[PDB]
Write an enzyme that holds these catalytic residues in place. Structure first.
Site, PDB file in Angstrom:
ATOM      1  N   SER A   1       0.699  -0.955   0.073  1.00 13.39           N
ATOM      2  CA  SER A   1       0.102  -0.015  -0.030  1.00 13.39           C
ATOM      3  C   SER A   1       0.680   1.174  -0.130  1.00 13.39           C
ATOM      4  O   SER A   1       0.299   2.263  -0.261  1.00 13.39           O
ATOM      5  CB  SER A   1      -1.094   0.292   1.059  1.00 13.39           C
ATOM      6  OG  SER A   1      -2.150  -0.695   1.147  1.00 13.39           O
TER       7      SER A   1
ATOM      8  N   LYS B   1       3.154   6.431   5.431  1.00 15.28           N
ATOM      9  CA  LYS B   1       2.138   5.617   4.631  1.00 15.28           C
ATOM     10  C   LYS B   1       2.719   4.135   4.976  1.00 15.28           C
ATOM     11  O   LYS B   1       3.624   3.875   4.488  1.00 15.28           O
ATOM     12  CB  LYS B   1       1.952   5.827   3.092  1.00 15.28           C
ATOM     13  CG  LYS B   1       1.004   4.993   2.437  1.00 15.28           C
ATOM     14  CD  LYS B   1      -0.232   5.219   2.820  1.00 15.28           C
ATOM     15  CE  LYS B   1      -1.268   4.117   2.458  1.00 15.28           C
ATOM     16  NZ  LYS B   1      -1.155   3.005   3.436  1.00 15.28           N
ATOM     17  N   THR B   2       2.013   3.368   5.350  1.00 16.00           N
ATOM     18  CA  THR B   2       2.137   1.972   5.924  1.00 16.00           C
ATOM     19  C   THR B   2       2.038   0.924   4.447  1.00 16.00           C
ATOM     20  O   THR B   2       1.148   1.486   3.470  1.00 16.00           O
ATOM     21  CB  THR B   2       1.423   1.297   6.900  1.00 16.00           C
ATOM     22  OG1 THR B   2       0.042   1.696   6.727  1.00 16.00           O
ATOM     23  CG2 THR B   2       1.985   1.882   8.051  1.00 16.00           C
ATOM     24  N   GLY B   3       2.599  -0.276   4.355  1.00 12.54           N
ATOM     25  CA  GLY B   3       1.849  -1.113   3.519  1.00 12.54           C
ATOM     26  C   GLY B   3       2.098  -2.575   3.928  1.00 12.54           C
ATOM     27  O   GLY B   3       3.333  -2.652   4.791  1.00 12.54           O
TER      28      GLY B   3
HETATM   29  C1  LIG Z   1      -1.752  -2.046   2.107  1.00 11.97           C
HETATM   30  O1  LIG Z   1      -0.706  -2.387   2.087  1.00 11.97           O
HETATM   31  C2  LIG Z   1      -3.034  -2.776   1.690  1.00 11.97           C
HETATM   32  C3  LIG Z   1      -4.046  -2.174   2.280  1.00 11.97           C
HETATM   33  N1  LIG Z   1      -3.549  -1.147   3.237  1.00 11.97           N
HETATM   34  C4  LIG Z   1      -3.477  -1.410   4.461  1.00 11.97           C
HETATM   35  C5  LIG Z   1      -2.497  -0.770   5.242  1.00 11.97           C
HETATM   36  O2  LIG Z   1      -3.237  -0.521   6.517  1.00 11.97           O
HETATM   37  O3  LIG Z   1      -1.398  -0.284   5.118  1.00 11.97           O
HETATM   38  C6  LIG Z   1      -4.050  -2.773   4.855  1.00 11.97           C
HETATM   39  S1  LIG Z   1      -3.189  -4.331   5.031  1.00 11.97           S
HETATM   40  C7  LIG Z   1      -4.044  -5.029   6.599  1.00 11.97           C
HETATM   41  C8  LIG Z   1      -3.379  -4.429   7.942  1.00 11.97           C
HETATM   42  N2  LIG Z   1      -3.228  -5.512   8.116  1.00 11.97           N
HETATM   43  C9  LIG Z   1      -2.857  -5.911   9.585  1.00 11.97           C
HETATM   44  N3  LIG Z   1      -2.629  -5.221  10.488  1.00 11.97           N
HETATM   45  C10 LIG Z   1      -2.849  -5.954  11.787  1.00 11.97           C
HETATM   46  C11 LIG Z   1      -2.109  -7.449  11.799  1.00 11.97           C
HETATM   47  S2  LIG Z   1      -2.520  -7.597   9.950  1.00 11.97           S
HETATM   48  C12 LIG Z   1      -3.290  -6.311   6.986  1.00 11.97           C
HETATM   49  C13 LIG Z   1      -5.131  -2.730   3.514  1.00 11.97           C
HETATM   50  C14 LIG Z   1      -5.447  -4.092   3.353  1.00 11.97           C
HETATM   51  C15 LIG Z   1      -3.276  -3.337   0.348  1.00 11.97           C
HETATM   52  C16 LIG Z   1      -2.146  -3.935  -0.404  1.00 11.97           C
HETATM   53  O4  LIG Z   1      -4.637  -3.964   0.000  1.00 11.97           O
END
Ligand SMILES: *C(=O)[C@@H]([C@@H]1N=C(C(=O)O)[C@H](SC2CN(C3=NCCS3)C2)[C@@H]1C)[C@@H](C)O
Length: 264
Positions: free
Chosen positions: A46, A210-212
């Site tokens: 992301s 911004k995370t991903g």
């Molecule tokens: C991006 O990386 C992804 C998007 N963006 C996300 C994000 O928040 O950066 C979520 S990924 C989701 C967050 N997760 C966990 N946090 C707690 C333990 S597991 C998994 C969202 C799906 C794109 C690629 O879809």
């Protein structure tokens, strides 16, 4: 550059967590950089949304109306991870509000709506080439770009390229002032970043990031850090692991940040 003390720490961290770590830090006060596997490709997950929001801001420079354009999307556009576009389905959202949602909640529907608004995946890529980023490549839409497979170059960039792009866009002259300002405001209001670079930085600093994350336990975070003294710092950390079902290691990113900031 890479100080011996940082090299040893990162390599031990990377080995212990059975992964591959990509780091690029640019200290814009002195121009010093710390680079670790910074020229290798990693799946950006992301974190690409930063480049997307920047591309929309660039487009707004010749379309002064664009941020306030109201998008009445529909249920068919909604994805599994779309909390803000879901919340506003009945009434729609402006492009500005879509950019805030995709940066600050990682909303996947908001991302795909903005890709469509720009004219497709290749428009994002051309935006990156226009700012000198030769490594960024967006190949798939959400949610399919999260596969993060070994040695697959789709949906990748390098830490060095992403850090240089974040520097030019947030801290340099790649965008006009109102736009660059807006991009930082969005990053500082991120809601997803507490466990990653923010967790490794002094509590007094301001972090905009911004995370991903994705399969192969891929755990990424890209940030500008505003320290109590000195100029802003860019930090990009990418991390991926051996097996497809590996769990993400947000603590590794916090530890990388502690190691790097100790050197500053
Ligand atoms: C991006 O990386 C992804 C998007 N963006 C996300 C994000 O928040 O950066 C979520 S990924 C989701 C967050 N997760 C966990 N946090 C707690 C333990 S597991 C998994 C969202 C799906 C794109 C690629 O879809």
């Amino acid at each position: 550059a890479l100080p011996a003390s940082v090299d040893k720490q990162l390599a031990e961290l990377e080995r212990n967590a059975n992964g591959r770590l990509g780091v690029a830090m640019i200290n814009t006060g002195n121009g010093t950089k710390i680079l670790y596997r910074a020229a290798q490709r990693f799946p950006f997950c992301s974190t690409f949304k930063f480049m997307l929001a920047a591309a929309v801001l660039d487009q707004s420079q010749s379309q002064p109306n664009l941020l306030n354009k109201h998008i009445n999307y529909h249920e068919s556009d909604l994805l599994s991870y779309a909390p803000i576009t879901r919340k506003n389905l009945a009434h729609g959202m402006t492009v500005s509000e879509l950019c805030a949602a995709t940066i600050q909640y990682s909303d996947n529907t908001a991302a795909n709506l903005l890709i469509k608004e720009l004219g497709g995946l290749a428009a994002v890529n051309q935006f990156a080439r226009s700012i000198g980023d030769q490594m960024f490549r967006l190949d798939r839409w959400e949610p399919d770009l999260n596969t993060a497979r070994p040695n697959d170059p789709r949906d990748t960039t390098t830490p060095a390229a992403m850090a240089a792009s974040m520097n030019k866009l947030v801290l340099g002259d790649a965008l006009r002032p109102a736009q660059r300002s807006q991009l930082a405001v969005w990053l500082k209001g991120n809601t997803t970043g507490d466990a990653t670079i923010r967790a490794g930085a002094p509590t007094d600093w301001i972090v905009g990031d911004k995370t991903g994350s994705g399969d192969y336990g891929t755990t990424n975070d890209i940030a500008v850090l505003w320290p109590t003294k000195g100029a802003p710092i860019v930090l990009v950390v990418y991390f991926t692991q051996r097996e497809k079902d590996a769990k993400p290691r947000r603590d590794v990113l916090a530890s990388v940040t502690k190691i790097i900031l100790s050197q500053i």
